[PDB]
Design a protein around this ligand. Structure first.
Ligand SMILES: [Mg+2]
Ligand SMILES: [Mg+2]
Ligand SMILES: [Mg+2]
Ligand SMILES: [Mg+2]
Ligand SMILES: [Mg+2]
Ligand SMILES: [Mg+2]
Ligand SMILES: [Mg+2]
Ligand SMILES: [Mg+2]
Ligand SMILES: [Mg+2]
Ligand SMILES: [Mg+2]
Ligand SMILES: [Mg+2]
Ligand SMILES: [Mg+2]
Ligand SMILES: [Mg+2]
Ligand SMILES: [Mg+2]
Ligand SMILES: [Mg+2]
Ligand SMILES: [Mg+2]
Ligand SMILES: [Mg+2]
Ligand SMILES: [Mg+2]
Ligand SMILES: [Mg+2]
Ligand SMILES: [Mg+2]
Ligand SMILES: [Mg+2]
Ligand SMILES: [Mg+2]
Ligand SMILES: [Mg+2]
Ligand SMILES: [Mg+2]
Ligand SMILES: [Mg+2]
Ligand SMILES: [Mg+2]
Ligand SMILES: [Mg+2]
Ligand SMILES: [Mg+2]
Ligand SMILES: [Mg+2]
Ligand SMILES: [Mg+2]
Ligand SMILES: [Mg+2]
Ligand SMILES: [Mg+2]
Ligand SMILES: [Mg+2]
Ligand SMILES: [Mg+2]
Ligand SMILES: [Mg+2]
Ligand SMILES: [Mg+2]
Ligand SMILES: [Mg+2]
Ligand SMILES: [Mg+2]
Ligand SMILES: [Mg+2]
Ligand SMILES: [Mg+2]
Ligand SMILES: [Mg+2]
Ligand SMILES: [Mg+2]
Ligand SMILES: [Mg+2]
Ligand SMILES: [Mg+2]
Ligand SMILES: [Mg+2]
Ligand SMILES: [Mg+2]
Ligand SMILES: [Mg+2]
Ligand SMILES: [Mg+2]
Ligand SMILES: [Mg+2]
Ligand SMILES: [Mg+2]
Ligand SMILES: [Mg+2]
Ligand SMILES: [Mg+2]
Ligand SMILES: [Mg+2]
Ligand SMILES: [Mg+2]
Ligand SMILES: [Mg+2]
Ligand SMILES: [Mg+2]
Ligand SMILES: [Mg+2]
Ligand SMILES: [Mg+2]
Ligand SMILES: [Mg+2]
Ligand SMILES: [Mg+2]
Ligand SMILES: [Mg+2]
Ligand SMILES: [Mg+2]
Ligand SMILES: [Mg+2]
Ligand SMILES: [Mg+2]
Ligand SMILES: [Mg+2]
Ligand SMILES: [Mg+2]
Ligand SMILES: [Mg+2]
Ligand SMILES: [Mg+2]
Ligand SMILES: [Mg+2]
Ligand SMILES: [Mg+2]
Ligand SMILES: [Mg+2]
Ligand SMILES: [Mg+2]
Ligand SMILES: [Mg+2]
Ligand SMILES: [Mg+2]
Ligand SMILES: [Mg+2]
Ligand SMILES: [Mg+2]
Ligand SMILES: [Mg+2]
Ligand SMILES: [Mg+2]
Ligand SMILES: [Mg+2]
Ligand SMILES: [Mg+2]
Ligand SMILES: [Mg+2]
Ligand SMILES: [Mg+2]
Length: 150
RNA sequence: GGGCGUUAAGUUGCAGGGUAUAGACCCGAAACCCGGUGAUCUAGCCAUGGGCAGGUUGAAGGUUGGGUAACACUAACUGGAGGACCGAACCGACUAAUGUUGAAAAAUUAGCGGAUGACUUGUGGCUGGGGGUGAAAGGCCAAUCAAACCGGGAGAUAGCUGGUUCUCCCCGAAAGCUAUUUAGGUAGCGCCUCGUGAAUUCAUCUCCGGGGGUAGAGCACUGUUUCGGCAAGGGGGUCAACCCGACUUACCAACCCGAUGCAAACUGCGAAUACCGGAGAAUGUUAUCACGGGAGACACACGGCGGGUGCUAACGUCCGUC
RNA sequence: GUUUAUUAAAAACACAGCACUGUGCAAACACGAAAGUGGACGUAUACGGUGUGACGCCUGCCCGGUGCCGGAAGGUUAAUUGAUGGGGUUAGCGCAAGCGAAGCUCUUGAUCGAAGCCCCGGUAAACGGCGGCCGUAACUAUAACGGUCCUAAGGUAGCGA
RNA sequence: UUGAGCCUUGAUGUGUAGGAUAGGUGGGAGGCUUUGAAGUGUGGACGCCAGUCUGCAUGGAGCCGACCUUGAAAUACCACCCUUUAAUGUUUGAUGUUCUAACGUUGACCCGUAAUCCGGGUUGCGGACAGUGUCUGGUGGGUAGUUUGACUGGGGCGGUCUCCUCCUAAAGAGUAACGGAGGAGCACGAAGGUUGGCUAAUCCUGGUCGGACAUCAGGAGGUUAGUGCAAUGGCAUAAGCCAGCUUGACUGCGAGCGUGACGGCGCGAGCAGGUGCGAAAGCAGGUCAUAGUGAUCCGGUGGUUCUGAAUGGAAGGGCCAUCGCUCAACGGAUAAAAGGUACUCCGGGGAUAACAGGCUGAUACCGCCCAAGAGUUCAUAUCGACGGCGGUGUUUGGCACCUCGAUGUCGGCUCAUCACAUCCUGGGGCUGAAGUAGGUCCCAAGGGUAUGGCUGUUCGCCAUUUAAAGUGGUACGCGAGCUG
RNA sequence: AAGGCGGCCCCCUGGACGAAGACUGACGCUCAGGUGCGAAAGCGUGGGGAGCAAACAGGAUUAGAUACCCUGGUAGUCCACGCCGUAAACGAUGUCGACUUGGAGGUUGUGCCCUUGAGGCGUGGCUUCCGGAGCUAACGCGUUAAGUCGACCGCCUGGGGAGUACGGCCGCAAGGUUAAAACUCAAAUGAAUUGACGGGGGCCCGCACAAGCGGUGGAGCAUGUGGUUUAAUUCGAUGCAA
RNA sequence: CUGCAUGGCUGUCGUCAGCUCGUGUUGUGAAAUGUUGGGUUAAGUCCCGCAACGAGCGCAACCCUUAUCCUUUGUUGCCAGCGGUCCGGCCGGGAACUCAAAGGAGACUGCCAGUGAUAAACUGGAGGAAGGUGGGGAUGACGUCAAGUCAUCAUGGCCCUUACGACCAGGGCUACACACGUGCUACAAUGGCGCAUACAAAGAGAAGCGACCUCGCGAGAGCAAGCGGACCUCAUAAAGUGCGUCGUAGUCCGGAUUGGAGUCUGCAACUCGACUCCAUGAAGUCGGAAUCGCUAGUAAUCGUGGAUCAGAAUGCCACGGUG
RNA sequence: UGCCUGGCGGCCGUAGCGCGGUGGUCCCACCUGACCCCAUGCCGAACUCAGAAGUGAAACGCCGUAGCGCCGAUGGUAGUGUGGGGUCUCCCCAUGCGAGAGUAGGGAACUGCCAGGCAU
RNA sequence: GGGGCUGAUUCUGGAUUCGACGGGAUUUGCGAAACCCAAGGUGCAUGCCGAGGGGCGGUUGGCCUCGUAAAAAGCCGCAAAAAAUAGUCGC
């Protein structure tokens, strides 16, 4: 479909409950590479300062060096396109010393790039172990039930 | 009304210039097909007989001894197998020299490889040319092979190359346009010659009418460009040195006006020459036009003039006039 | 060993070994319009063809495409056979144009109709093909790793200006 | 097992009207009852379950028939029989099981015979198979006949092949290049004809959204807008924009003229017939004009005042209108076509290339001119930016002028000449020249001006000497002096 | 003997035990080298190949899953002759001799008793479980000793480096065998004890679920916390237990 | 400032039921028995069996409240009986009762059957207000969380003595875009509205609670008697009950926001309390994942008192009504 | 015959704009209202059909203004057809034709038909 | 050194990035700079030489002054020398 580079390592590391389909504001070469040219969404987080929740973590492979007059770099703070109705939640519940906002996926909608973002906490090894334990234990319990029922 | 006719004599022989089919001015192909001849050279195969001097290496195997229950294994004697080794005859030609109208249309000289086998050789036969054969090189098939030789079609074709032989007199060009599987050929026209007819037909000069829009010139229009005024003012301010910024900071800056230039694809204007028509004398062997017979030719070059292209470079190239 | 007699004797051909394929005999194949012959007076441990070429380690992935084989569920489909439509002719109807039954004709072609092709699968020791792009590790430097466009796969073992 | 004529239609039905399974037109009514009627039941059933062929066990004798709801009169009747159903005798096209007499036998025996060919006889096998003859679909470089264009500042590649607009095009017409610039392979029954009416682009002011922008009112300006399209030439009488009517976007001609070698193309007053608009005078044979396109042959369609192979028709042909070709290589070879040859060959060319020679010198080398400066101040002792003018032919370049009826080109060995823009030696000037030793410039060609490793070298790197191991032309010297 | 051996039948053959009988007369045990056998996997030749199944293909879970799972699938597993000689080749216990309390069996002989039942009393061979003395660090062994001895062979001397490299041998190969050194470390270890944990098992309790009831999360209202802003938003509490 | 030096105090596991010691025994020894196993339970409660025998902290009981009865003593608490009435406990009087607060009796598996191991213990029941702890509260082990407080207080170092110390005025803890937590109002016809009308308990009161009269639509204001309080006040409790009214509605539903003018306490409510009138009438119209408490007078629903307090609860702590 | 007005033409940039103010006794324009018969893709903005209350206010026309637009000499220059030359990417001479722009200057139009209204 | 394909999520001529962040214009209160003024109050100033300024220095020299010139204080610099910055992550 229209799905482009998505971060699933963050999806595993977090248990995000927030889903905003906010868009992104980009320059020319950015959308050039996003259409084809491998914009990378790995290691993504927001940098809310004023009303300026830049997507700080995002890489990209430039299409070419056609724009030779001015030298650009892949490491740019891409801005965000989100409603002020929902921007208050980020103005609020982001500073909890243990809460972050990360980008899950990036896709196309009528030739406009929309990057999904979500609020998460962060999982440390001892709860990932419990999550995997429960995931495998549900399967084991269902298998045991089927074997007992025959 | 328009096209073709209605004026107008043709025909048969002779000779001559053409045209069409027959070879069609002559010499010359590489090539195709058909019918025959070759395996005595060479390539393969079959059948029958010869050749490999001489000198080395010790595998299988067979005995004796040790050893094993029997083997297996081990020591001694015989053994002479190898697409085995060196090297003669024989076969071949890897290197260098000689020679290149030579001794010889592939050899000689001094070296070289195989030399008991996938070897070599004598005799006879078999394999036929779009086929044969080929330890595979497009190699050989009788000094000739990416399709052998003889004869026939056949004097194939050749828009190609060369040649085309006695004399005199008169006239006398082109290397241009169009079309072309066309560009070095050809066909029509432009140009030439001969004959028949025809009008002051044609040419030079003088006068008259008309078209220009090229030189030159100019910026009314389409583009380009410079310095001034009207201005919005910005950019390092001298100065505060943090100021509103006092202010012009070797900067840029819409229209509007005043000047200065450029243009093949600009012309509010605009020549000479070039070209057509009307009138007139003088001169020119009708030099002008129409038809018919016959061609030749469509590879041009230089200089002068106005130019594109090139470097206003070329004995360079492309156009128009002499 | 053989090879271009007569400028190339070699890395060029052959070779034993190995792989695939067809071949049940009146075998495949080849020469022959045919008879017939070779294969072979042989019988799948044999013959022919195609690849590589003693021997040691191996022949890794892919049938997208072209060949080959297996199947005929569906579509198309020759030759063959001939259901209708139309036209010609006229015995006769028509005071006239015009109708016009049989017989003979030219034409369209209803239906039947195999192989083949379309389709499914296998076959690579069949013809063949086997990726680029970016970031990321305690200074430099690289990338174990990940993100993702495409393919049939992205080149394994081994070797390397 | 099996296809339609075939013994029979055993048969179907229905306005929401409904004893409803309606009488073919002409006759509306027993032909039924000995042309065997409703009777009891409850397979199968059409099924709008109101019903319905209701079919069929023992009967031995009446259902209907008026039509009730009626827009249609019972199928209980004479019924070329329907919105449609069925089994067996008539016909034999396939897939099969079985037999031998065709056919085959490179199974066995015997004979001709003395004979592994052949033929005949006997006996077995396969068997209407295989195979062969004609047609036919597929496969089919195993083999054959062929094609693969031109222009081109040598060929190939790149680009072009037709038409139109501007300039080169030198003030009539025409006029070339692989010159500079753009388009065309259409659209429109209105975007045409007539009549009537009308005149923008741009800018300024005022005004509700409304804005650098619309729709309005006034003004500046006069074609700086517009043409269905690219460009040129025009358009105010408007060719530019609307409204009403219409099809002249007609038929057959056509004096004359322009442009082309020709095939051809275009303009055109006016005549005859019939139309449209306008009261009328008058206009209309397409579009403001120039691109919007393709010969011939072969065939298709409709009419024909024709032709009709003895007659009468017909078939066919001709005539008129018209259709089927990115034949774009566009004056179009045929309906039907790609490459390699270093295994090549033939006829030619220096008309046409590569090595050379000639011409010019963009480039190459060298010289000179003015001066921002570098150089502790200081432009010249050395250099010199931004710019310019020249010499040689000397590299890379352009032309194709001699040579393709033959001029052998790279490099290496031997053999040298000449130039001076001189490497050294020789003679001098300046110096940012103290001396030794250096930088630059002038004159001066008398002489000299390496050895080895690398690669086939020229060039170059390296090692070691010398005063240097200098630059060029000599067909980038020299193969009728040598190799390769 | 070990590895190992499972329908039935036949052919050849090795080994073990017992009833009674006679001789042979120390011929007896172990074993460095050496030889032979030797699970499976593996390699060569010639076959076979139903099922299973490395490698491999596809699907699936997962952030990733080159695995566990699913659908296919080659070598292999099978036969004959050959090659290596590796295993947790384990009883982690080298062969033999005799001595040292018992119980419950299993298998297989043999003597005698009234064999009325797999009735009893003795004696042998193999083997299982429990256990006394004894032994061991403990677990545990315990007449088949890990109890006390005798004869012989092999091996061990800290964990890594390493049973690694080199070297000799064997082998077609994979690899096997003999076997170090430099360097680092203060430990590396085994039996058991007490906690703790288990996606180990068993039992039990609590509004912890199951059957309710009402609320919270939805929209203002009264509070505290985090961040924001300010000169301060004074400080502390920051899971259930703020 | 250091609760990462502490004393003291407190939360959690958990009102879970375990945590230990003396002697003896077993194993060289860390250690084990006792504390496991069988019934039983609210429970290491009890019994049985057993290298165990006993004890301590512990799960129970003793402690506080309430559920029945008896007795002692009746004012400010009550009227069985009588008299009168101003019909009112009014007071003479009556000390049985409702009640006041002291001591006892009383529930102890005591008994009766069944079950079990001849036990412990369990099931049912004649009695009782009561049945297995009758119903609630206090009582919180060994110990874990460097758990929270050095800002209640004390305390060891460290830090300042012209300043981190001392005094005063004005602002801030109550704050512009949000999130989270605990409660309240609610959503409506089970309801709000207008007018009558009963049913409680527990507490407070001395510069304090504050009767009555009058002005007040009102918070309240002048007047104030009584009360150190079974006397007098705070303080006609609400839900309900009677009657109409509202008919599923931007509602006579929700009273959040906002404007006008005041009432009480406080030198002084703009930052920053509350009550009262008029009007305005935000949402909402039963709430997504995921969640919280409760097993009987408990969950819900209604009202009141009290703590610090000049005033300020929708919070906290307790009584009750219905249930 | 002279004033001015109307219609049709010739001449179409000395023939056209800007400024000053006049014209009505005539002719024209403005205008009145409008059922007709005609008209607006809405309105008598335009066509018109019935007329003269007023005005020359806008137009139209006339007279002067040199601010403009234009017409533009002589002379000079550029160019060149022929012939002859140099130092030849360009130029000289003998010859005729001789521009464009810019100076001097001109300039506020002439003229033919009828149709009326004016003095004669 | 020269040709062809891409520079299109659309090839087919008309995307509101739905949102925050520039810019426009429309509907609201005001401050002589979003206004143009000396009239109520009836005080001692406009300007005239102005002194160097919070701890330090300074602005058109007057925002702060007055008597015949001096402290200067309404702002700007030193200064606030909380700008040290998601989640995961050792002793
Ligand atoms: Mg020929
Ligand atoms: Mg040929
Ligand atoms: Mg030999
Ligand atoms: Mg040899
Ligand atoms: Mg020789
Ligand atoms: Mg020899
Ligand atoms: Mg030899
Ligand atoms: Mg022969
Ligand atoms: Mg060949
Ligand atoms: Mg060849
Ligand atoms: Mg031949
Ligand atoms: Mg030939
Ligand atoms: Mg011939
Ligand atoms: Mg000839
Ligand atoms: Mg002559
Ligand atoms: Mg030619
Ligand atoms: Mg003549
Ligand atoms: Mg000309
Ligand atoms: Mg002629
Ligand atoms: Mg002629
Ligand atoms: Mg020509
Ligand atoms: Mg020609
Ligand atoms: Mg020629
Ligand atoms: Mg020429
Ligand atoms: Mg010329
Ligand atoms: Mg020239
Ligand atoms: Mg020239
Ligand atoms: Mg030429
Ligand atoms: Mg050899
Ligand atoms: Mg040779
Ligand atoms: Mg044969
Ligand atoms: Mg090979
Ligand atoms: Mg090999
Ligand atoms: Mg392969
Ligand atoms: Mg396939
Ligand atoms: Mg097939
Ligand atoms: Mg078929
Ligand atoms: Mg292969
Ligand atoms: Mg290597
Ligand atoms: Mg004979
Ligand atoms: Mg048969
Ligand atoms: Mg071929
Ligand atoms: Mg073929
Ligand atoms: Mg061919
Ligand atoms: Mg050509
Ligand atoms: Mg011309
Ligand atoms: Mg008109
Ligand atoms: Mg008419
Ligand atoms: Mg046109
Ligand atoms: Mg033709
Ligand atoms: Mg006829
Ligand atoms: Mg016909
Ligand atoms: Mg055609
Ligand atoms: Mg052509
Ligand atoms: Mg030749
Ligand atoms: Mg020539
Ligand atoms: Mg040359
Ligand atoms: Mg020459
Ligand atoms: Mg200087
Ligand atoms: Mg020389
Ligand atoms: Mg010199
Ligand atoms: Mg000399
Ligand atoms: Mg001399
Ligand atoms: Mg030389
Ligand atoms: Mg010579
Ligand atoms: Mg036996
Ligand atoms: Mg041994
Ligand atoms: Mg095995
Ligand atoms: Mg399987
Ligand atoms: Mg599997
Ligand atoms: Mg095997
Ligand atoms: Mg071992
Ligand atoms: Mg072992
Ligand atoms: Mg032994
Ligand atoms: Mg045994
Ligand atoms: Mg034991
Ligand atoms: Mg090893
Ligand atoms: Mg689990
Ligand atoms: Mg006027
Ligand atoms: Mg003049
Ligand atoms: Mg002039
Ligand atoms: Mg002039």
């Amino acid at each position: 479909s229209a799905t482009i580079a998505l971060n699933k390592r963050a999806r595993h590391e977090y248990f995000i409950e927030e889903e905003f389909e906010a868009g992104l504001a980009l320059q020319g070469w950015e959308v050039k590479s996003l259409r084809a040219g491998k914009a990378n969404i790995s290691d993504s987080y927001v940098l809310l300062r004023d009303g300026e929740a830049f997507l700080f973590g995002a890489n990209i492979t430039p299409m070419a060096v056609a724009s030779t007059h001015v030298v650009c770099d892949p490491t740019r703070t891409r801005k965000l396109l989100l409603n002020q109705r929902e921007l208050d939640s980020l103005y609020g519940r982001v500073n909890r010393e243990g809460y972050t906002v990360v980008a899950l996926s990036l896709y196309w909608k009528n030739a406009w790039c929309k990057v999904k973002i979500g609020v998460a906490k962060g999982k440390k090894q001892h709860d990932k172990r419990s999550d995997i334990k429960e995931r495998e234990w549900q399967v084991d319990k269902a298998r045991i039930m089927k074997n007992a029922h025959r």
